[PDB]
Design a protein around this nucleic acid. Structure first.
Ligand SMILES: [Mg+2]
Ligand SMILES: [Mg+2]
Ligand SMILES: [Mg+2]
Ligand SMILES: [Mg+2]
Ligand SMILES: [Mg+2]
Ligand SMILES: [Mg+2]
Ligand SMILES: [Mg+2]
Ligand SMILES: [Mg+2]
Ligand SMILES: [Mg+2]
Ligand SMILES: [Mg+2]
Ligand SMILES: [Mg+2]
Lengths: 169, 204, 292, 159
RNA sequence: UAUCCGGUAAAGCGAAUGAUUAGAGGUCUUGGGGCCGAAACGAUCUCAACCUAUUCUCAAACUUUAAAUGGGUAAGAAGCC
RNA sequence: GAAACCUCCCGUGGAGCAGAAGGGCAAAAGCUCGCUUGAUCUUGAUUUUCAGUACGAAUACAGACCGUGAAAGCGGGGCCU
RNA sequence: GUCUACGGCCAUACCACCCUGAACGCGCCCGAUCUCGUCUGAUCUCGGAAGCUAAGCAGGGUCGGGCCUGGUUAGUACUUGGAUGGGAGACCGCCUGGGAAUACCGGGUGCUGUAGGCUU
């Protein structure tokens, strides 16, 4: 009989790190835009790495943060391609989880020889009512303690909500 | 090779440690500041013989090491290979200098010759713990070790238990209290203060 | 495991930030520029029209700063407004206007400049400001303390500021962030501004919801539907309130007495209680373990 | 030969004390100096506009001018053989009221109280101060218990 | 007699910075070498760095502390009311 | 993959602030944007080196003409040396 | 008793975890038509008032860390002035006045200004 300790999805994060720049990245930005229904953001590199073939302030990745119902919907699709399995290590100690998909057309998108097959990266910021405290301007705070989502608590939310297994190893 | 010990004796200059500024310093002769059975428990060595200094003088790394070997050799030969623990309690940190002559006194400022310990009046140089059997063997060890140092140093047997800060009269009771708790060579003094969950690990 | 970031050491070396900086209240960078006088002004005040919007309220205070703790010459709250006419929407821009306006009038009534400096009456919305009359006591002048509010176009603070300006305080301002001013053109309507002052932005939303879906309107404007505040009633309501403020701004409080004087709180546990309490925990541990 | 630089040797002088860095708390700014206020100068690291020179830190002097956010302040600086009263323009943040004068004003106020009264009475009162006189004649009762004997303690070597 | 200024002596390093000894404890890390292992955070040691309490010993160009001696002001008619 | 991008947590500054080092600095003095030319015109006063001359460097004002900000303000080069 | 708004001094006010919060507040909270701003109504801006003290916030708690303040350390370390004092030197003792700092052990754990609530 808890009032608002209702573990919800605060946001869903999606990022395609092509690590190229130019055209490949502009191509991958269309994929997220088709998926999420909003323009994404290009992130640039921190610093040059001659190994990976990247340069400082060169656009490496594209990403986006989905919120609300659309984030619930896209999360659902992402678990369907993963078949509602995760692991213990897929959850972070902070009570967030995430998982890859190897190819976006699995979610439900049409391939093109140009706009190819960008594998991508789901990550779910779980939260509660009254987490905003941390990130507002004026009278800020820290979210107590018996209110912070545990790893265990986030696993059981997944185990209930999306009927998942959380396989061991 | 190096200068006589005569010439670097009195604590004349400011302390000049190996640092950003003073560099290219040659490594100290003495390195291993303790030897014997150092992996021993507080209980199995309470004697604490000290060589105290009675001159505000500088001791050479060279003379420390030599004194350390001298004492340890005798301790081994006398009682036994694993029957003591000796602690040297003066590390050569002060860097000593040397203006060398093949220009004259123009631009004379030394290169680092060597390192040295500065020792105050009443400060301990070496210290030894072993058994109540073995008092005389330590004394002579420190006695022999005196001859490697310049100046003058008393040999003294402290009223502490081992190399602990606690008076040996009260050491055993304190353990019975659990004021004090063995911790390798040393002993952890527990007070009242800390949360009660610490107190529940003891008394249980 | 990792290196403990917050050691003894950490706390020994740690410096707190000021109390109100911790509480997330006072921008001391801005406070210094706002509040301190020029030393050659000496003890002449430096007033500021503080305005803060709470989740359910708008406060308007005039204050100068002394060393004991900045003194408050006058105040008006949005929760007073029921007296004057405003039943609902007390955090809305129109309410902000009333609340500011009311502060000016109440302030002016103290100094006897109620008859001099009527200020703007008809509510155009355009650039207005008070010229001090010669051979008369000059116009009161303070400055707007926005606080931590993101000072954008249409911010409710500037709703209050507009009010106190029309009320007859000379507070300097531009019209670059009254609601009306256009970013991609750079002119000011001052009929858009009037609408906002009169609550027509709210009335139209009310009319838009009722047209589309009854239930959402019923949900959105529940206290508006109770008290019977309708879209067509709205403009009149705020104009009545403006007049009533303008005719009597004086605050009378309530004569508070008949207090039982009882402790809701929990007082501080005395040394000796705390001293025993560990004593009992020590015993209780011992007697407990001497069994199993 | 040492460098003539303005800030040479103020590593410690202009350095906020331990756990008193950051915002210059506001009383400092908002307290009023008139003409002829006795004022002690004490440079501060946070505020670098209007800093006094390292020679006038510690030194007390009188205010002569008051601008918008600073105070002209005559202070006496010795130079080998000659003391030069000279006038410097310190920003408020480096300046306090010197209490040195207030204890004097307290005493003169107390004197004016004690001069008005004790005039109608007739009994004249000591207005001048007087240094601590020798401590008067008095008895000491060794009440019952006798004195406690103090033998000096025998030496022993601790270290 | 009031009142400011100070960062030297000393002291400190279970407080920062840097130095530095020892054992307790720790698969934190991970390793490189082993011994018993096909291999296994399996067992057993080990030495690397890191960390949890302790511990030895230091600083002209480090310091939480912090003297003595020391430098300002002030102690009235150019003042009070 | 030890290093690419994303996300949550801790983080008294252990980063950064052109350069030596010292000081100073966290809803900044750091970073990122928006608008800019106060690095403009003009009297004296003062500080620092000092002989208490110059130079340079700086501090407080004052008068113009601007900038920016809702405003209080800040700005006549570079946080200070 | 206690809160809100603006505060002064800035840890006796910080951090950690634990418990309790009547009324009024303060919040979280529900929305995006308009103002405003985002990749994203998360923040920011704006319009609300169905829920709830879970969190923030307050008050308390902990043989808590930390900070504050006493003791001890110690008349010890240091030190002004003195001697045709000692001592081969290094250094030390006395006279004359001044006098610290850890470890260790106690106690304390925000005070308060202006304006306005609530407990009628
Ligand atoms: Mg020879
Ligand atoms: Mg020398
Ligand atoms: Mg601001
Ligand atoms: Mg110095
Ligand atoms: Mg020293
Ligand atoms: Mg700059
Ligand atoms: Mg000007
Ligand atoms: Mg929302
Ligand atoms: Mg709560
Ligand atoms: Mg609660
Ligand atoms: Mg405590």
């Amino acid at each position: 009989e808890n009032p608002m300790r209702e573990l919800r999805i605060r946001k869903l994060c999606l990022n395609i790190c092509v690590g190229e720049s130019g055209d490949r990245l502009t191509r991958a930005a269309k994929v997220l835009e088709q998926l999420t229904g909003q323009t994404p953001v290009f992130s640039k590199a921190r610093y040059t790495v001659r190994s990976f073939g990247i340069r400082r302030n060169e656009k490496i990745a594209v990403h986006c943060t989905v919120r609300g119902a659309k984030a619930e919907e896209i999360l659902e699709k992402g678990l369907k391609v993963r078949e509602y399995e995760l692991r213990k290590n897929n959850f972070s100690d902070t009570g967030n989880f995430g998982f890859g998909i190897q190819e976006h057309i699995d979610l439900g998108i049409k391939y093109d020889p140009s706009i190819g097959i960008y594998g991508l990266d789901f990550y779910v910021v779980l939260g509660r009512p009254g987490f905003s405290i941390a990130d507002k301007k004026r009278r800020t705070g820290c979210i107590g303690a018996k209110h912070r989502i545990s790893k265990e608590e986030a696993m059981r939310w997944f185990q209930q909500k999306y009927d998942g297994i959380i396989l061991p190893g | 090779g190096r200068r006589p010990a005569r010439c670097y004796r009195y604590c004349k200059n400011k302390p000049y440690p190996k640092s950003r500024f003073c560099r290219g310093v040659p490594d100290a002769k003495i390195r291993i500041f303790d030897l014997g059975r150092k992996k021993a428990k507080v209980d199995e060595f309470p004697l604490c013989g000290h060589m105290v200094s009675d001159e505000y003088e500088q001791l050479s790394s060279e003379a420390l090491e030599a004194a350390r070997i001298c004492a340890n050799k005798y301790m081994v030969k006398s009682c036994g290979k694993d029957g003591f623990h000796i602690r040297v309690r003066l590390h050569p940190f002060h860097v000593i200098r040397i203006n060398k002559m093949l220009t004259g006194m123009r631009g004379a400022f030394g290169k680092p010759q060597g390192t040295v310990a500065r020792v105050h009046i009443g400060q301990v140089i070496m210290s030894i713990r072993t058994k109540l059997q073995n008092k005389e063997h330590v004394v002579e060890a420190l006695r022999r070790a005196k001859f490697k140092f310049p100046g003058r140093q008393k040999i003294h047997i402290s009223k502490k238990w081992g190399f602990t800060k606690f008076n040996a009269d009260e050491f055993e009771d304190m353990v019975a209290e659990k004021r004090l708790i063995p911790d390798g060579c040393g002993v952890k003094y527990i007070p009242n203060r800390g949360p009660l969950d610490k107190w529940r690990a003891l008394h249980s | 495991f990792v290196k403990v970031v917050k050691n003894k050491a950490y706390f020994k070396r740690y410096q707190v930030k000021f109390r109100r900086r911790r509480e997330g209240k006072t921008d001391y960078y801005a406070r210094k520029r706002l509040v301190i006088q020029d030393k050659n002004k000496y003890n002449t005040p430096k007033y500021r029209m503080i305005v803060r919007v709470t989740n359910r309220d708008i406060i308007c205070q005039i204050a100068y700063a002394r060393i004991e703790g900045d003194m408050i010459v006058c105040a008006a709250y949005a929760h007073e407004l029921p007296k004057y006419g405003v039943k609902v929407g007390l955090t809305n821009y129109a309410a902000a206007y009333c609340t500011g306006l009311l502060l000016a009038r109440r302030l002016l009534n103290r100094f006897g400049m109620d008859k001099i400096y009527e200020g703007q009456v008809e509510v155009t919305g355009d650039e207005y400001n008070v010229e001090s009359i010669d051979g008369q006591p000059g116009a009161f002048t303070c400055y707007l303390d926005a606080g931590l509010a993101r000072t954008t176009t249409g911010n409710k603070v500037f709703g209050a500021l507009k009010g106190a300006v029309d009320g007859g305080l000379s507070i300097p301002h531009s019209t670059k962030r009254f609601p009306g001013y256009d970013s991609e053109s750079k002119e000011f309507n001052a009929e858009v501004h009037r609408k906002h002052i009169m609550g027509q932005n709210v009335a139209d939303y009310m009319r838009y919801l009722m047209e589309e879906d009854e239930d959402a309107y019923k949900k959105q404007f529940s206290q508006y539907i109770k008290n019977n505040v309708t879209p067509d009633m709205m403009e009149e309501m705020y104009k009545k309130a403006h007049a009533a403020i303008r005719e009597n701004p004086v605050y009378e409080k309530k004569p508070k007495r008949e207090v039982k004087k009882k402790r809701w709180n929990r007082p501080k546990m005395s040394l000796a209680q705390k001293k025993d309490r560990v004593a009992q925990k020590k015993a209780s541990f011992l007697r407990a373990q001497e069994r199993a | 030969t040492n460098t003539k630089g303005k800030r040479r040797g103020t590593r410690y002088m202009f350095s906020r004390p331990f756990r008193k860095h950051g915002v210059v708390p506001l009383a400092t700014y908002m307290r009023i100096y008139k003409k002829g206020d006795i004022v002690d100068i004490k440079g501060m690291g946070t505020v670098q506009k209007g800093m006094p020179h390292k020679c006038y830190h510690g030194k007390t002097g009188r205010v002569y001018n008051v601008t918008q956010h600073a105070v002209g302040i005559v202070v006496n600086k010795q130079v080998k053989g000659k003391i030069l009263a000279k006038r410097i323009n310190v920003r408020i943040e480096h300046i306090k009221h010197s209490k040195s004068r207030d204890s004097f004003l307290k005493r003169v106020k107390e004197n004016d109280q004690k001069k008005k009264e004790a005039k109608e009475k007739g009994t004249w009162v000591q207005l001048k101060r007087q240094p601590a006189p020798p401590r008067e004649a008095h008895f000491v009762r060794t009440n019952g218990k006798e004195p406690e004997l103090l033998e000096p303690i025998p030496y022993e070597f601790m270290a």
